[PDB]
Design a protein. Structure first.
Length: 374
């Protein structure tokens, strides 16, 4: 007597949506074309989960959520590093490992009635007034579902299938921005004032704001920090023609990382950093009329890294949707319709504060404390 749902994509948002719909009693099947990540056979290593992200997770799986979330490191504020290495504490997010979080969600799903189908690529959907026929490559295969949830990322195959059934406003924009993953190792000895082998304070998000480029650092449980450099494709491509050019760039702009980061390794991470396509995506509506499908996460609204908070937004997507389904007593057609109306309102504002955040933190940086004169 239960309805079936296909959830396309077992990233962070797909796993959470599957937990939520299995909890609510739907017959959930969760698809991904990738292999089970938990086998020996990630856009970042540790990520920040916000209070709102945590609450979404809590609303959906209260039991698991504390087990899922207790290696996470609470951040009390941001620490701003200037060109002279001065650090300013600005008191207020929690640091958590991406792979660990994704795997824990998969583990919780295994305790559920959810069917996990890895190595299944959605290629086509036939939409009807009854069940939706999902075509997979696994070897073509079809399966029928009462409805479909697209959690399949910025390039959503689901979204493209939906566009055939509904008139969807849609935009994609490839941003100039690139990011490079850097690493700050644990210290040799335990540091009492920090509560671990941390080179710098682990209870702050560290930010080295510069003019249209930036370094950040976020603590990992083992004392290390996940660090990320952000800059334009042109700036980075201009730098990495020369190892010496990269090295001197880092020393000049981030002098207080020289002692805590392997600069020779950092240079190599710059030079050999892989091809990236950061794309921003928006669309309207998020649903196929009659409750037949809905888009959550990056599939609905891929946004700019750091200035936007995509995982947190996607987690909030799921919480909002479940509350609407409950408000409508399981009427998916009316719930999905209200979801697209109210979420789009939210997301224009979210995109609004993201750009404003870009403006104050990275565009408007000309002070002598933050911009070098040479
Ligand atoms: C460097 C970086 C750091 C970030 N850090 C943070 C952070 O700290 N906090 C935060 O809030 N956000 C962060 N974000 C954003 C966050 O990573 C994303 O918003 C989020 O992971 C998107 O989750 P998702 O499940 O919607 O999509 P995805 O992670 O893209 O997963 C989609 C899944 O669908 C699968 N799939 C795709 N197509 C198909 C198909 N046709 N058939 C079957 N399966 C398919 C894919 O294999 C994939 O597993 C970061 C982004 C970047 C670039
Ligand atoms: C470890 O690397 C990452 C860590 C965290 C995140 S995040 O998704 O959680 N983004 C976040 N931005 C802020 C933030 C701080 C101050 C000013 C502003 N502002 O936009 O004005 C935003 C805190 S957390 C992303 C990362 O890589 C992209």
């Amino acid at each position: 007597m239960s309805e079936s749902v296909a959830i396309i994509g077992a990233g962070l948002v797909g796993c959470l949506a599957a937990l939520a719909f299995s909890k609510e009693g739907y017959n959930v099947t969760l698809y991904d074309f990738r292999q089970d990540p938990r086998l020996d056979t990630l856009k970042s290593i540790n990520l920040a989960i916000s209070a709102r992200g945590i609450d979404a997770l809590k609303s959906i799986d209260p039991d698991a959520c504390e087990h899922i979330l207790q290696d996470m490191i609470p951040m009390k504020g941001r620490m701003i590093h200037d060109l002279k290495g001065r650090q300013e504490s600005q008191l207020y997010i929690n640091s958590i490992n991406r792979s660990v979080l994704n795997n824990s969600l998969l583990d919780e799903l295994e305790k559920s009635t959810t069917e996990l189908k890895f190595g299944h690529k959605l290629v086509k959907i036939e939409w009807t007034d009854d069940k939706q026929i999902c075509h997979f490559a696994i070897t073509p295969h079809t399966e029928k579902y009462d409805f479909v949830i697209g959690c399949d990322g910025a390039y959503s195959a689901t979204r493209s299938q939906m566009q055939r059934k509904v008139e969807m406003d849609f935009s994609q924009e490839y941003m100039n921005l690139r990011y490079i993953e850097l690493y700050i190792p644990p210290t040799e000895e335990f540091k009492p004032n920090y509560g671990g082998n941390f080179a710098i304070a682990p209870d702050h998000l560290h930010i080295w704001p510069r003019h249209k480029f930036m370094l950040i650092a976020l603590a990992n449980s083992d004392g290390s920090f996940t660090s990320t450099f952000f800059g334009s494709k042109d700036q980075i491509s201009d730098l990495i023609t020369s190892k010496s050019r990269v090295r001197e760039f880092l020393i000049e702009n981030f002098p207080d990382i020289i002692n805590i980061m392997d600069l020779d390794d950092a240079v190599k991470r710059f030079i050999t950093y892989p091809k990236e396509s950061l794309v921003c995506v928006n669309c309207k509506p998020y649903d196929v009329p009659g409750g037949k499908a809905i888009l959550l996460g990056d599939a609905a609204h891929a946004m700019v890294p750091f200035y936007g908070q995509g995982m947190n937004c996607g987690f909030e997507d799921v919480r909002i949707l479940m509350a609407l389904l409950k408000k409508h007593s399981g009427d998916r057609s009316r719930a999905f319709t209200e979801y697209t109306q109210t979420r789009h309102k939210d997301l224009v504002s979210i995109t609004e504060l993201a750009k404003r955040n870009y403006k104050e933190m990275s565009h408007d940086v000309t002070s002598k404390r933050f911009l070098l004169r040479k």
